[PDB]
Paper text:
N501Y in the receptor-binding domain (RBD) of S protein is a common substitution in Alpha, Beta, and Gamma strains, and is often found in combination with E484K and K417N (or K417T), with this combination described in the RBD of both the Beta and Gamma strains, respectively. For the detailed mutated positions, in Alpha RBD-hACE2, Beta RBD-hACE2, and Gamma RBD-hACE2 structures, N501 is located in a loop structure and could be replaced by a Y without creating folding problems, it seems that the N501Y does not induce a large conformational change. Some very weak hydrogen bonds are possible between N501 and [name], but the phenyl of the Y501 side chain could make many new favorable nonbonded interactions with hACE2, i.e., a cation-π interaction with hACE2 K353 and a π-π stacking interaction with hACE2 Y41. Thus, Y501 significantly increased the interaction between RBD and hACE2 compared to N501, so the N501Y replacement in this region of the interface should be favorable for the interaction with hACE2. In addition, the E484K substitutions would seem neutral or even unfavorable because it is far away from the RBD-interacting residues of hACE2. Therefore, Beta RBD and Gamma RBD exhibited a higher binding affinity for hACE2 than WT RBD, but a little lower than Alpha RBD, consistent with the SPR results. The deep mutational scanning suggests that single residue mutation K417N or K417T is likely to have minimal effect on the binding to hACE2, and that the E484K mutation may predictably enhance the binding, while in this study the structures of Beta RBD-hACE2 and Gamma RBD-hACE2 indicated the mutations, K417N and K417T, decreased the RBD-hACE2 interactions while the mutation E484K displayed little impact. Interestingly, the decreased impact caused by K417N or K417T could be quantitatively counteracted by the increased binding effect associated with the N501Y mutation.
Author numbering:
A (entry chain B): 333 to 527
B (entry chain A): 19 to 614
The structure:
Amino acid sequence: TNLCPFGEVFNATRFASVYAWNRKRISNCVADYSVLYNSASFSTFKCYGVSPTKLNDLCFTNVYADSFVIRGDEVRQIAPGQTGTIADYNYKLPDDFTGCVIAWNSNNLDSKVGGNYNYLYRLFRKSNLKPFERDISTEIYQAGSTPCNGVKGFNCYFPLQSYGFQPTYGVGYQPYRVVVLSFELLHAPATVCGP
Amino acid sequence: STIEEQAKTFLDKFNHEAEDLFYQSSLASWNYNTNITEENVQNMNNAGDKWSAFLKEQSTLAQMYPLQEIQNLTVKLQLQALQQNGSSVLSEDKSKRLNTILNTMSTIYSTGKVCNPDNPQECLLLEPGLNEIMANSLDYNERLWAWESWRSEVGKQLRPLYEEYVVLKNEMARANHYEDYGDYWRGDYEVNGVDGYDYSRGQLIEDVEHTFEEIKPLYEHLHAYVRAKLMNAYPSYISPIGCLPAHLLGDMWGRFWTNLYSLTVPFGQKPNIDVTDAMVDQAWDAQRIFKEAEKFFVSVGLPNMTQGFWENSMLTDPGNVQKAVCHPTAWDLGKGDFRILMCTKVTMDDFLTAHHEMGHIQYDMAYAAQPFLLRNGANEGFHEAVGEIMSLSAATPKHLKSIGLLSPDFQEDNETEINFLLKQALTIVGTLPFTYMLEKWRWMVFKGEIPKDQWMKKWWEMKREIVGVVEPVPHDETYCDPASLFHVSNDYSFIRYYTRTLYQFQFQEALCQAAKHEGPLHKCDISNSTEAGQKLFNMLRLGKSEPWTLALENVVGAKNMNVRPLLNYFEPLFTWLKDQNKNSFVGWSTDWSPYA
Ligand SMILES: *[C@@H]1O[C@H](CO)[C@@H](O[C@@H]2O[C@H](CO)[C@@H](O)[C@H](O)[C@H]2NC(C)=O)[C@H](O)[C@H]1NC(C)=O
Ligand SMILES: *[C@@H]1O[C@H](CO)[C@@H](O)[C@H](O)[C@H]1NC(C)=O
Ligand SMILES: *[C@@H]1O[C@H](CO)[C@@H](O)[C@H](O)[C@H]1NC(C)=O
Ligand SMILES: *[C@@H]1O[C@H](CO)[C@@H](O)[C@H](O)[C@H]1NC(C)=O
Ligand SMILES: *[C@@H]1O[C@H](CO)[C@@H](O)[C@H](O)[C@H]1NC(C)=O
Ligand SMILES: *[C@@H]1O[C@H](CO)[C@@H](O)[C@H](O)[C@H]1NC(C)=O
Ligand SMILES: [Zn+2]
């Protein structure tokens, strides 16, 4: 009766930046998914392919928990077939995504009067992200044709921008902690059932 | 990558960086305005200096993308606005001279003192000292003393500064490829590259004068009626065919004739509608006032106030120790943060002011989705026009009876309607010749059509001819009477108050049409009309993204400023005024003066 360490992911002291989103592989344990869906503590709980209603009666080989922080208006970008600074440059979900997206307001934790500049996001990139890809590079973005020489300048911008979460922000600009659960199914032992 | 693509990326970085720095400056400014401490002034200046320095650097960077290679008009709108006038097109030395001149003129105006003869210690500022005299006093000599002393001791200081101010402002404007500084000011209404909606800078002069001609018959009868009533009050001071003396108009300059209501009320036995007592009887507080205002905008389909609005706004005077600036303001800090600063009292006036300021908020929330540089009114006159029409509907007896403040037994007769419309005309109609004449003088001074040795000669020639107002004391060219007004000495364009006045009644007539209002336009209430709210919202969400001609067409169906709704609003008074002036002379002679 090994319980899946979901508390490590949802109740972490600090979340990752969306450009450097964390991934926690969950294996060889019993997961009570109904506790999360029937807790009434999340503003967003949407599942794709799988059903949140009592589908802890199923077994999966590996479960991945992806966690990061974005603003409220960008939560809608964590979904299949979406476009925006987060979806194309920070965290991309596949069109055939099978899993759940969980989010909740974290203005009481990730906001600070004067600005909390701990959480960043990628503003510029040469191309869009392939699904479940992570880019933590700090290369200076070349917007023009003159080489940037590794420092900011005219047509040469630092690719990462800060949210600067303040508690007096509107809901659309307040920080939100997002947990994405991926349910993988290989021709494999299927070690994560979780009655 | 093309030039346009590099401009898009450059604007992408500017927007994010500008929003963060703008929020920091606005938050620091908010903390001072609600909590006046020596510290807060420094934090406000520090945050503001970073914001100004950021704008200066970004404006220079924006200049390296020439507008001739951009086809996307929305991109070009943001780029040109960023390119602004540039980062001080002038030399550094001339930019420093102009800055000091502007600060000195502002300091002279805000600190100018006038002392009563025989007591050099009992001196009065303009606010509240001299303003109180001009707004309440009925004594001819006391009003004349305040009028002359303000211009002879403060205006004379501003005359040399304003002369050099004109030269430097023109040099900046002409180097910005404008004809003059007045032409630079008229650029706020300029529209290019949009077929069927273009508008030239010179067209503004044409349209203002053309619409003012239709205002003249209404103002002439208003002028004649006011002169007749004042002639009964000061019989040895007013000629029946001459201009009104400048110091007997209700304030320091005659900008508004509002304070002439007591001496010019048509029916002085029927009192005004004052629901202040009813509000106190029902134990209303500031939150109730803003809750009712929020109720009003929801009834027409507009969204309710955000949750941060109620937590972060200051709807009451803070207290006895913590000081705050009590001027009613609506704050758009960005990042979804909308607040109202107001030291609200339980009065009818503050009840209407809350509707006015919340109208600004609704405008700010509507175009919040627009890019940062396009988050503003369609032109300089749109924002206050939106705010004014909210107080129009909220102040009607129809609206006040529906919210329980006006008793249903109370019924309005046509005498009270004339009293209300006359009070409206003293403020709204009375300022139109004053506003147009003042800006025309500045336009001609910037254009170079008025020589320096004829500034005051031309200033009072136009006052007599256009406004029907005559100076009580002759003034030579050592005076700078236009600079005695705040806007002239503090470098603010003034034509916005003329265009906004015509905009608001165009807005109200269109919205009341969509609300299916029956009867005179001044009795209309757009409450409970989602059709009116949707029509207004179609323009509010636009912001600066579209030409103001197109934004105006969204509400009223016309592409240009029109004066007919203004005359439609005041038609019951205009008919009454013409009947009153049958025994009086209509018009004025410009050669009569009180000093003979
Ligand atoms: C001007 O540029 C803007 C943005 O650079 C264009 O708007 C984009 O349109 C695409 C679809 O073609 C959308 O996917 C983007 O989300 C839009 N972005 C924004 C910021 O609106 C706009 O279409 C361009 N206008 C013209 C006339 O070309
Ligand atoms: C986080 O902590 C709360 C309170 O201790 C608990 O109810 C919740 O289950 C925890 N989260 C997870 C994923 O276990
Ligand atoms: C006012 O500002 C001071 C600092 O200048 C601060 O210590 C104090 O808490 C503030 N008071 C309020 C009511 O915000
Ligand atoms: C505003 O209205 C929405 C319904 O559209 C409601 O959910 C919200 O709680 C309201 N907020 C306030 C402050 O009234
Ligand atoms: C709007 O409609 C509501 C519900 O019918 C009513 O209570 C209210 O008095 C109306 N307001 C006006 C201004 O007619
Ligand atoms: C108000 O109406 C009455 C009734 O027709 C009329 O005699 C009176 O002159 C009117 N008052 C005006 C128009 O000021
Ligand atoms: Zn206003």
